[PDB]
Each structure stands twice: as C-alpha cells, then as structure tokens.
Symmetry: D2
C-alpha cells in the first residue's frame, strides 16, 4: 500500500515479470506493508541471462579507464543520495537511521570506490622458458556471474559483491533477500545513470528456493557469490557444483570468540564487548558472541557491561536519537526468543533483558531487549549455536592456553580478537586463533583494503582487499613457440 | 601376482588395512596380475586423518628453509630413481618406456623442485590505515588436505598435487586410482626417506565411491584436489561442499580444439595434430581431439596425417623402440571401441585405424589402433563427447570467425591451440578461445611456471605456477589498533 | 608582454622572488615576448624546501583515500582546462595545436588519473620467521623530492613526474625548463584548487646551472627526477650523488633504431617511419632516427617516404590544419642545420628537405624542412649523434643478424622497433634489441600502465606503470622479537 | 710470509697480474705477514671485463633451473668447507673463531641458498590495452656488474652481493678490501668447482683509489654495488654516475639509536645494548652506538652494562673461549683511540675500558678494550661521528617525543631499535624512527628474507629479500600492435 508495485530490472529499465505471482515487503518497525514485489519466472531468468551475455560484451570491450570512470561516477551519486538511500534501507530493514546514514552506503561506496581505482591495475604474468619460447597469462572476466544477498546489510552487501565483479569486467545478476528487496533496485537505477551498459547489472526479486536455486543451476552463469547462513551455504555450494562446476565465494555465519586477557584495561574491554554484540541489533555476522574473561576479573567486567547495556537507546529507527531498533522481521524475532528460552532452561545466568519489549508503539514491531547471559559453558545451545540477534554469552577461564583452546573449539571460523597491553601476548595469541578476521584492541572495523572471510565452515574465499578482485577473473596461460616443434612419431 | 601384497601407508610406514578386502592391479599389455592391494576402511580414513593432524604440526613448526631442504632431498632421490620408477609406471599403465623415462618422473619432479625453491617466498601483506593503526595478513597452512589421483599420469599427478600442498606447510592424504595404485606408494616411501615427518604424506588405496567419498566427507579435511572426468568431478565437488564447505581444485576433461589456419606450415600442423591425439595412446586430458582444417587444405592435411600415423610404432611398452602402447585397461578399451562404432554408424569417414589390434601377443593386451575420422560434423557423438583414447576428429571450416565460434561451442574449456605464421592472427585468435591452457605453434608442453586448468566444465582452480602455491594457504587478516577505541553505546 | 609577469609558486600561492632577476619567454613561431618570468634565489630554494617539508607532513597524515580523491579532482580540472592549457603550450613550444589539444594534456592527466586510483594499493610485506618472531615492511614516503623538466613536453613531463611522487605521499619541487616555464605554473594552481595542501607542489623558475643545481645539492631533498640530454644527466646525477647520496631517476636521449623487415607492408612501414621521425617537428626523445631497410625494399621504401614528406603541412601552429610547427628556438635550429651540413659534407644522399624555411611569415619563426638522408653509413656523425630535430637517416642492410648488431651498436638504448608480419621474427628480434621501450608494428604510444626508460646511457630507473610508484617510497623492515633474547656476552 | 703469493682470479683459474707490484695482508692478532698479494693493472681490469662479457652470455643462455642447481651446489660446498673458510677469515680479520664458524659463512651461504631457489620465480608483467593491442614486460640481466667489498665481513659481503647478481643472470667482477683479500679468492674457486661458467665471478685485488676507480669508470660495467663509509660512497656513486650513468647500490655507515623505554626489563635492555656495540669487536655497521636511557633509570642501566662488559672474554681469536678479538688493523686501532681521547677531552664520563690492551702477547696485536662513555651530549664528537670500534655512548632523555627527535637528528639512517614491553609504544615509536633496518626487543639479526639498507646518507637501494633480486634486472616493455596503425602525415 505504501510504495508502488516493484518490477524486475533487466536491460536498463523496469520490465514486467512473467510469473503472475507477488510477495509483500513489510516494514518491521510497525508491520506496515511497504510494497507488492514481483516474482521472477524461470523464463525471466533466461531473459536476464541473455541480457547479461550481450551486455558483458559491451562493458568488457571498453578500455580499463572507461570502466573506472563509470564506476567512480556511480560512487559520486551514492555520496549524493546518501540520505535518501539510508531513509529507504531503514524502512526496509528496521535498522536505525543513525547507522544507515553513517555506515551502510558509506562503506558500500567505500568498497566500490577502492575497486574503481584498481581497474587499470589488473595484470597478467610473463615467464621466459628459453630463447625460442615464452609464456604470458591473461586475467579474463568470468562472464555472467551471480550474486545472492542477505537481508542484514542489503545495499552494502549488494555493493561489496558487485563492485569487484563489475571492476573485473563481469556482468552481474543480483538477487536481494525476499525480506529486503528495495535499495538493490535503487542501486540498479544508479549504475545505469553512471553509464553502466544495459544488462551489466540486472536484479531479480523472489525466494531462495525459487529464483536463487534457478540462478545456482543456470549453465551459463560462471560464478556464484552468496552471503548468509552456513546450512544454506552448503545447499547453495552443492547446487553450483553439481549443475555446472561454478566458481564460488560464500560469506557465512560464525560464533566468534573475544578474549579479555588479565592485563587489559576493563573500560576498553567493555566498550569492545558491547560494540561486538549489539550493533545492528546483534544482526552482524562477525559479532563476538562468545566473551572470555579471567576468573579473577568477572565481577568488575560484568559491572561495566550491564552499566553500558542499561543506556542503549531502544527506539523508533526513524528517530535520530535511536541507536537500537527492531530485528529485520517478526519470523526472526521469534527465532531469537527461541534461543533466550533455550539459555534460561540451560542454567545460564541472565544479567539483563531477555524479554520482548512492547510499551506504547513497540508492540506493532519486532523488538527484543538487548540480552546478556553470563557464567556460561561450552555445551550450551546458546554457546554452541549461531543466534543472529542481541545475545552475549560470557565465559570464565583460568589460563591463556585454556582460553585459546576453548576459542578454537568450534566448526566456525569467521572472526576472533584479543584485549591486552603486552606486545608479545597480543601477536602470540592472535597467531594461534583460527579465524580469518582478527582484531587487537578493537572490534568491527572492516577497511576496503582488508581481506575478510571465514576459516572452516564460515566461508570459501574472501571479500575486499586486492585478493578479491583477482578471484573474479580467470587465468589463461599462453605459450608462444618461436622455434621448431618436435614430434616423437 | 608379480609383486607382494600392497598395504596402506600411514605415519611413515606400511600398516594393515581393516576392511578385510583387496583388489588386483593388472598389466594392460599382457593381463599379468601385478599385485593384490588393500582397500581402506572408514576407520582407516579416520586413522589417516589423526596421523596427518599430528604430522602437519611438526612440519609447520620447522623453518621455511628446513622444509625447502627436505623437499629438495626428495627431488634428488627421484632423479636417481627415475628409470626404476619409470619401469614400474610402464607396468601399471601400459605407457611406453620411451615416455615414462622422459616425461612422467622428469616433469613430476620438476614441479616439486620448483616449489621447494619457493617455500621462503610465501609472504603476507601489510597495509597502513593511519598513524594509530595498521593491518598485516598471514598466509597460514590450511592444515590437512586430500588429493584424489587419475590413472593417465599416476606418479606425475601425485607430485603435482602434493608438491604445492607440502611446500605450503600442509599434510596431504592421497588416494591413487584403483587402476594405477603402485607408484603413489613409492612416492610416500621417498618423502619419508627425504626427511618429511611421519603423517605428512599418507596413501590410502581403494575405490572412489568408498574411500574417495569418505575423504571428501570428513569434517577435519580442509581442501580437496581432484583430477578425473567431469561427471565425477561434479559429484566430488558437491560432496566436498555440502559436507563441510571444503576448498576445492578440480582438473577435469575436455574436447579441446586445434585450429590450423591456411597460412600454417602444414607439416608442423600435422606434427602437432598427431602429437595432440596419440601421445600416451590418446589418454592425455588436454588432447586436441577436434582438429579444424580449412576447406582448401583438407586433402593435403589428410595425406600428411595419414603418412605420420602409418609410421607409428605400436608394440610392447617394455621395448625402448615402442612409441604407442595399449590402453590403460580392458573396460576402457571397450568404451573407446564403442565410440569408434558410433563414428561409423553416424557416417564419419574412416581415414585410418578403427579397430582392436589382436595379432600374435597383442591379443593378450588392450590395444586400439591410432584412429582418424574425417568429414566430421558438430552434432556427431565422436565430436561432442570426450573419448580418452586414440581417436582424432578432423572438421572442415571456411572462415576464421566460424572456426573460433565452433571451437568455443562446447561445455568444455580445458585447452586450445592455433597454427599460423601470422603475428596478428596468432594472438587475436588465441585471445578469443575460451580455454585455460592455450598453445601457439606447439602442443602439450606444461612448464612448472605455467598455471594450468579449465574454463567452464573442465575445472575449478589451477595447478603449477606461483598462483597455485598461494591457493594452498588461507589468509588471516590482523588489525592492530594502537590508539583509543570508540563505542557508540 | 602578451601576459603579465609570472612569479614563483610557493605554499599554495604566487610569491615574489628575492633575486631581483627575470627572463623573457618567447613564442618560436613569431618571436613575440609572451612574458617576463622571475628567477628563484638561493634563498627562494630554501624557502621552497621548508614549505615542502611542512606541507608533506599534512599530505602524508591524510588517509590514502583522502589523497586519491584530491588527485582525482585535479584530473577533473585538467580535463575541463584541456583546450586552454593546450593553447598556452602551443604558444610556449611552437607545437601545432592539433598535437597539444590531443596529446600533451590528455596523456599527462591519464598518468595522474592512473596513479590517483592506486594510492590505496601501496602495501608492505609480512614474513614469518618462527613462532616467536616475524618481519613486516613499511613503504614510507621519501619526503621532499625535486623534478627537473625538459622543454619538448613541458606540462606532460610535469605530470609524469609529480603524479607518482604525490601518489606515494611525497612533496615535490618542480623546475621547468627556462625555455618553457608557462604551463608548469598553471599545474600548481590546479593542484591547489583540487585541494592539494600548501607546499606539496611548489614551482621554481630559472636556469639549470643556478636553480636546477641548487636543488640537486640541497641536503634535505631525498630524490632527483630529471628529463633532458645525456651529457647534462651525467652532471645532474653526479651532483645528486656527491652532495647527499640522493635517489635518482633519469630519462635521457637516444638514437633509437627502427628495423623494417622484408615482409612488411611498405605503406605501414613508411607511415611508422614518418611518425617516428617528424611528430612534434622531430623533438621527441624516443624518435626512431636510424631506419634500417633491406637492400631489396630500398627503392620502393624511399619513394613511399618521399611521398608522405611532400604532403607534410608545415605552417603556423595556431592553424588547426598544421601538423609540423617550428623548432623550440633559434639556437636549437642552428644546431640542427649544422647536423644537416655535416650530413652533406660526409656524402650522405639527401632524399628531401635539408634547409630552413624562410618564405612569407615563416622567416619570423624557427622552421626547418622535414629532412630525410639515405645511403647512410654507421660511422657518420648524423648517424652516431642525437640531433633532436626533423632528420631521418636511412641505412641499407642485407641480413637480420647484421641489422640487430648494427641497431645495438650505440651507447644509447632508449627505444627500438620492428615491422614484420611474422610471429616468430617479431618476438625473437625484439628480444635481442638492447632498449627499454620496444614497439612491434607501431611507434610512439606510451600507455600509463607501461614502464618506460633507457638502457645504457639513455637512462636510470623508469617512469609510469606499477613499478614507478614503488620507487617513490623507501622500504623500512621491522623485526618483532616476541620471545627471548640471547647475548653471547 | 705465511702463505704463497696470491694471484688474480680471471676466467675460472688464477692468472698473473701485470702491474709488477704486491701489497701485504697482516694478521691483526700478532702482526705476521699472512701473504703478498698482486695489485691489478688497468689492463688486468680490461681482461676481467672481457672475460665477464663472454662468461655472462653462457650463464644467461642456461635455463632458470640449470642456474638454480649450480648455485645450490655452491651452497653444498660452502656448508662442507664452513670450518676451513672460517679459520682463514679469522687469520685475515682477527674475528673470533666463535664468530666466523657460526655467523660469517653460515649467513653468507643462507643468502646464496635463498636466491638459488628464486631463479625460476623472476617474471615480467602482461597488460591488455584494447582488443587489438597488449603489452608484456621482460626482466633481463644488466650484464656485467661490479661489487666492491668492505673489511668487516669479507666473505659474507662477497656472497650477499654475488648471490642476487648471479641469480638474476649477471656476471660480477668483485674487488675485496685491500685489508682482507683472502677469502674472496676462495669463494671464486668454489663457484668454479660448483660449475659456474668461466668469467661469471672474477676477483681483482688492489686499492680502491686505483682498481675500484677503474671498475667504477668502465663503460661496459652496467651496475656497481658498494659497501663502506659514507664519504667514500659519495665519490664511488659520483664516478659511477658521471662516467656512464651506471645503476648503483650503496650500503654505508651509521650512528644508529637504541631507545630503552621505562617499562623495559633492564636485564634484557643491557644484553641488547652490549650485543649492539661489542659483537665483532665493535665493527658492525648497524651497531647501536647511541643508547638512550630514561633519566630515572640511568643509574641502574649503567650498573647492568658494566657487569656484562667486565666479563667480556677478550683474547686470542684462535682460542674457542674468546668472544672479543683485536680490531682489523693497527691503523684502524689508532683511529679508535683518537675518538677515545676526543671523548675524554670533551668530558663524557668513562664508565669502563678506554685504552689499548698490551699484556704479554696482546702487545703484538691490535686490541682495544670494550669502552662505554656516559652523561654524553648531542654535540660531542663521539656522539655525532661513526667510530667503528667498541665505543658505546649512553644518553639520558626525559620524554618519548624527545628521545625520538634526538635519535632522528642525524644525516645517517642505517639501523634503529626500541626496547619496551608495551604494544602501542613498540610499534608507534618504530614507525617514527628514520632508519631502513628496525628492531623491536632485539638487535643484529638479518634474515635472508628481510631487505636491509640505509635511509638518508646511509645508503641507496637494499640487499636481501625479494626486492633486491628484482633490482639486478632491467625492465624492457614490449608493445604488440595487432591492428591498424594511424599516421597524421
Ligand atoms: O669500511 P672501509 O674502511 O672498508 O670503507 P672504505 O674505505 O669506503 O672502503 C670499502 C671498500 O671501498 C674501496 N674504495 C676506497 N676508495 C675507493 C674509490 N675511490 N673508488 C672505488 N673504491 C674505493 C676500498 O678500498 P681498499 O681496497 O683500499 O680498502 C674497499 O674495498
Ligand atoms: K522488509
Ligand atoms: K572452508
Ligand atoms: K594397472
Ligand atoms: K568452472
Ligand atoms: K618559450
Ligand atoms: K643506465
Ligand atoms: K688482514
Ligand atoms: K639516500
């Protein structure tokens, strides 16, 4: 009822889907139906893929600097529409305006900016073999690739995925989550306005079981990049493999440790603790959801953590003074409620919240109190499993080696971090932790330059940094024989 | 049996399997039983993993130059044992002595020697952020990895997969083909003698549906590297993915095009085409089994191909004089003979060969004659489908753009080559061919420095070159904060 | 007095010199005094050094992306002002407007644009030694650097030097040629407008022997980058070295060979010969001034050269239809004509040109006719010595090995080139040519991605490409001991 | 004389010099004439260059792995002869057998080993411009290069220079210090026994004023690599420049700061300080000769230094229990004693040593007792100038920002270090120190992987690491035009 019915974006304009079917997008701050959103048919996919083939041709026939200028011109617009975009993402996701205005488009574009400047730096190798022969390599685009996004940072992830793919000279078809489809359509508009050729960035709306699956199976898509949960990642990765051997990147979940050592400043430690857990209503995949403190310091540190959780400003995401909103959807609110009832039953001590909050307006939304449990153990459902909502488990320990031992004991391997003032301990410990994203006296900063991804079952491949751009090309080796050819026959 | 029963190799020695079962390996030249070989159990797979976990720790704790020296010592033993290992390879595969003595151990050891020099050159990055903070990255081992071998180049594949795996500080569990298990066990012996710690290279014998599967499923194995057919590679990759999101490299098959432009040296062209079809009796994955010839040279090209094929010395692979041997097995002979009958039924013109060679002793072995069809068309089964025996398909074309479009019109993408004396044409054509391994005026050479692998359904990732070494490490990113930390709560 | 008096540029504005001394800059087409220009004092050099030390701290304290955005903005302004700056370059140099509007500012800004995008890509290395020790490297700015410009491409050369220097976080003091000081001053206005901090790009006008030399001697300057003649470069590099051991870059002169092989299209070959000799009236350092023609092609080639030279449009460089202007000055013209008379005295055969053009208003300018000598020999002064005016020397050869030996028989080694259709010969001949800048079937194009500089006495170091950015940083190696320290004492 | 007359080494064997003149080499421990040594003539220089030019061709014509194997064999030989080369180095330098057996040959061979593995990793670049054009680079050998060695580490410096030069495809002519000519000749024998072609490594003995000068001036030598004092480096670098514009590398002297912060453990800070001043009897270029201690820790730091200095085992370098021998020469001893009197005369407090040791046999040798001065001031001659003997100057500071400003206030910039247990301080301070070689909580280790050399007036270029090998090649860019060529004429 609130916004007009959303169409598929294919070949540089909106087109009518050919399914007959729609879904609704719902503002989770207060249940308001934000839009009717068309669902792509299997033949819509065929059409988007044929569009991308003919478009990729156009874009890759440009010189590298012509592609860099078009991408930079898309970065200018994103800076220019920062606020109007952040307004939309907030209605779509329930995330506070104080974060969307300041992070989502700001880091989305930071990454696109970084890669736009690197287009001319994509190079191959030359290797001499003998006087009469040498080899050179070319790094070529994959062709049409496909991205499949999450609902927690919708426009940002849409940028972090398509920035490298387009910079590497690929056409991308993107599928936003059914939960949050709005700003990805806006990104498509913008890119077209930048001069990005028709077909180079198509968007298909719908569900993971339908349009997602049809994207992983399509014989003419050369790579799948996916962001989301581990159990889904497995199905997604198996589908791309068994259909046509696609190249893949997966950014998945984690249950990341944070080790406070006994020499840490505890004020620092608590700030890091609270920042690692409550930002975006605990809806960040890298969150430091397992907090280790020394036994000799659990009382003091539990003091400072409650002190700070007490003053989180829960409120309207629309409000400028809000720093904590609702969760992305109601379905997801009761998934989190289901872990908090799990923690309670398992004798885990509750230190604050745990209860859905409805006073005045709050009841028309999906609001959960920031929740903290303490005196936890390793076999607890809340300690072993990923929650994806504002729930912090706190664990006591007696020595360094034990803390590291326990930090590593997981199928997960996304992030990890340490709080100490000692040079030796800081490096020594971090070298021993099994995560791809490691922090020393900080948490959460993710620079365009820093490769990020998971160890173990949190990922395959990486995002950001120079490495990620390379992995959106394919290597062709060329051997040039300048002398005689010898045959045995 | 010609030899003693072949046992599993775990932890620097031979150990009894716990399956209660074996299989035979057979000499395809004469049907002699070479050995009985033990099948690994599920619990033997668990034993091999526990052994690799412990051994990898010891290997990783050495210096870079200590690992380098150990691997260079293994190279030295391989050069010394070249002729003996070549004689065993010839027994197990049927490949002529003239090939195993010059190619298999020479080039397998060339790659180990390459990576041994490169151990000290593996390095991370460092990226300043501001005065108060920087990042560094570590390239850490993956831990335990697994390789699954093919039967065309048994010891060479074992070396090409284990060399970068061990140079990068990992342990590998290797599963040789059931068809060809013998030389892989000898390579495990040599790594041990060289100084490689117990458990760093273990060998498990048995089948793909059983031991290949238990390897690709295991939660503690971090990466799978597999060489084999495209259909099986699809199953392997999907199992590696859906079980624990393992990293993967796939080297698969193809139907690789050779284009002979009308300005080519025709004798060079025919030398290349026969080398690209008939080396190792037509059982090389990169073979150029679609040969495009211009309409005006078809008759002259055919006479040149016929002349070379008539002087091929098919015989006993123990004779130094033989340059063309039996096929690897009797089942594989049957499949090839079926492709030959298909060619005939669909009315391609038989230029030469086209049957089993059975005169005298040859009737004991699995010998298929060097076979050339001509007047082929793109919809024929012999043209569409990988045969992996000695069958060349010659296809007529009229213009350059048509040859390249027909060359590229396949689900495969392993290799491609062009023959032309024109500078512009050579590079222009090669830049448009969609394959990872591209040759100008030559075929088949695969230098240690040159990364090799498939586009499309012919592979995922690469082997050889500087790049492949980087792909047996995982990136850890470490942000160091030296300043104040800010919290928004 | 076409323009008002031109002042020193120091600290983000124009400042009065303290010398009491000025020079006149003149238009070479007509003798018109364009402007009075101030000469920097020795006190003014000091003032510019202190200004640069302070501005560099400000520029290096910014983030990498802060610096990128500022240089990208300078590029936008250069793009807008292309036609204006070209007009002033034409006034100052005599170059046709058809060249300055297309080449000079276009290719100068291309290099700044290239480097602007790479600012965030500059990284150190990280090397693990053992569990308890690792090394990291930093690539830190050099600090204050100086560039000394040549008169043939005044603003392009100011761009090619300042761009990597600023991108790598340095401040630069630039000294334009006394012959062409006008466009360097506008570049400094542009940098300031884009937001480059005060003192990061300072410009000092006056002589090489006074102000050029005070810069090369100053103990706070870390690197000198110079473009000009070989004999001057020896003096400059010698002074930079003996004063305070500076880093140096040197882009010097040449006598570059172009080999025309007997399979070339003679229209392509003659098009390449004339471009390689007569662009910017023969005042390009990389010019291909020794043109090797096979005995069998000599007559037909000379006819095709004579034909192009007869339709060269020598005239007023303000006329868009001019493609061959006057030389930069009358002194220079005098030198050139002495070379021509030497060619005549030494019995070389004049194909065409060989005289000053004095008819109509041309007597007011420094115009020399496009000149071609043929029947030349290797011991001729016109063949041995760099002329730097529009004078081609044609030399006959009989075999390839002879042509290559003769091409390499020089103390110079800036550029070289070959024209042939043959794949094998193109690469093999170019691999044997002792020059840093090599062209197959083309001449003169110099992409921002392509490192360029001399072998032998034609240079030290390179400009452009990835490599050059690296060479405006200094390496610092940091070893972190995290374990015990052992003394033998 | 102890040994036979030493001859020039040219073309894989010893040859007679043609000067008619010798010099003597003296054992500094007892004053015995170890050997008469031939002075190379101007003409002997020409002979060595001509032999290098021919030998370089043969060496560069081998494959990368053939050169790798030959260099690795030279490593093997150096390992087996470690003890014998060590004994001869002790004779020539006076260094303790405890040092020469463990450091000099071990680490010189470590660097040779490192580069031997890297020969095959030297690659150029590939850059696509458009469909019709691309560029590739070649990294080619410089040709003939020269190394000029110092007397403090004669065989180690001979190997650190020749290793990357030979690894990159070059021949080197090497001139050892007149003070220490013996072990360089032995290295030339070992290279030839390893299979290095005749002329690839030639050795010329004699003075820098004469033979070093003849090498720096020779027009066929392409690069000079020099180790020694700053003032001599300035002359060598200027002569290399003005003669033929050679490439250069300079490793020169220093007055390197060691800053001990207040949290430092004083047992550790004192072990680092004595190892930083008295290893090699004070004769290491990177020595931490200015020791900054906080005012409030001065008293206690001084006690711990004296206690370690008192137990230094000065004695006969041929006795294994010696860990402190004579200086390299009597002239050098005389120079160190004049700095000692400068120190006294200028009223620095003598903490210990400060005279020559003349008891019994020592009076026959060149022994200066370990010396520490304290209460030193920044203007004192001992604090400003490089001494190159065993003289530590201790300096009080009061605040961090200050200690870092004092450390930096020098024209030198070779090494620096900090001792501190705090994380933020260790890294923040090192980042501000203007030195190429930086140590945290350690001193003196120089891994083969780690690029080392001087900031400011302490050097140009680097030795060791990946980057050094890169600087023993020249870049050639090759533009391949595959389409039409456009002329303006
Ligand atoms: O320490 P340190 O005393 O060895 O430092 P240094 O006096 O700078 O000498 C280091 C090396 O440089 C040589 N050298 C001296 N002057 C030279 C010159 N003008 N040209 C070329 N080489 C020269 C030396 O000659 P010597 O062989 O005379 O030591 C020695 O081999
Ligand atoms: K929604
Ligand atoms: K994984
Ligand atoms: K077999
Ligand atoms: K693929
Ligand atoms: K002028
Ligand atoms: K040079
Ligand atoms: K001596
Ligand atoms: K310097």
């Amino acid at each position: 009822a609130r916004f007009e019915e959303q169409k598929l974006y294919i070949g540089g304009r909106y087109v009518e889907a050919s399914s007959g079917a729609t879904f609704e997008t719902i503002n989770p701050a207060n249940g308001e139906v934000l839009a009717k959103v068309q669902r792509a048919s299997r033949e819509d996919v065929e059409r988007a893929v044929q569009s991308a083939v003919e478009g990729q041709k156009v874009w890759a026939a440009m010189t590298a600097m012509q592609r860099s200028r078009i991408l930079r011109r898309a970065v200018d617009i994103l800076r220019e529409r920062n606020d109007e975009l952040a307004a939309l993402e907030t209605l779509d996701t329930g995330k506070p305006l104080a974060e969307t205005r300041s992070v989502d488009i700001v880091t989305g574009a930071d990454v696109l900016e970084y890669y736009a400047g690197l287009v001319p730096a994509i190079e191959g190798e030359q290797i001499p073999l003998r006087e009469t022969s040498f080899v050179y390599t070319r790094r070529e685009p994959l062709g049409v690739v496909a991205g499949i996004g999450a609902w927690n940072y919708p426009v940002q992830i849409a940028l972090w995925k398509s920035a490298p793919a387009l910079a590497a000279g690929n056409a991308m078809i993107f599928k936003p989550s059914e939960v949050t489809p709005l700003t990805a359509l806006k990104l498509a508009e913008i890119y077209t306005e930048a001069g990005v050729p028709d077909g180079v960035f198509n968007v298909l709306t719908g569900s993971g079981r339908e349009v997602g699956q049809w994207l992983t199976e399509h014989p003419l898509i050369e790579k799948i990049s996916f962001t989301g949960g581990t159990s889904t990642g497995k199905k997604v990765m198996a589908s791309a493999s068994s259909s046509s051997l696609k190249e893949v990147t997966m950014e998945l979940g984690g249950k990341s440790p944070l080790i406070i050592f006994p020499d840490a400043d505890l004020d620092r430690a608590a700030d890091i603790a609270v920042m690692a857990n409550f930002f975006s209503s605990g809806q960040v995949c890298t969150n430091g959801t397992r907090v280790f403190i020394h036994r000799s310091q659990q009382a003091r540190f539990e003091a400072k953590v409650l002190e700070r959780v007490q003053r989180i400003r829960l409120g309207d995401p629309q409000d400028e003074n809000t720093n904590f909103g609702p969760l992305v959807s109601f379905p997801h609110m009761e998934s989190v409620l289901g872990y908090i009832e799990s923690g309670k039953a398992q004798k885990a001590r509750l230190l604050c919240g745990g209860e859905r909050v409805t006073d005045g307006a709050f009841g028309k939304g999906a609001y959960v109190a920031p929740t903290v449990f303490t005196d936890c153990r390793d076999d607890m459902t809340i300690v072993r499993e990923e929650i994806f909502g504002p729930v912090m488990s706190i664990l006591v320990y007696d020595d360094e080696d034990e803390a590291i031992r326990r930090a590593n004991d997981t199928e997960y391997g996304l992030a990890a971090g340490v709080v100490t003032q000692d040079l030796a301990r800081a490096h020594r410990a971090i070298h021993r932790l099994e995560a791809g994203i490691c922090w020393i006296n900080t948490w959460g900063e993710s620079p365009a330059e820093m490769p990020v991804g998971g160890y173990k079952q949190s990922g395959v491949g990486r995002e950001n940094g120079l490495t990620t751009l390379a992995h959106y090309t394919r290597i062709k080796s060329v051997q040039v024989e300048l002398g005689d050819y010898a045959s045995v026959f």
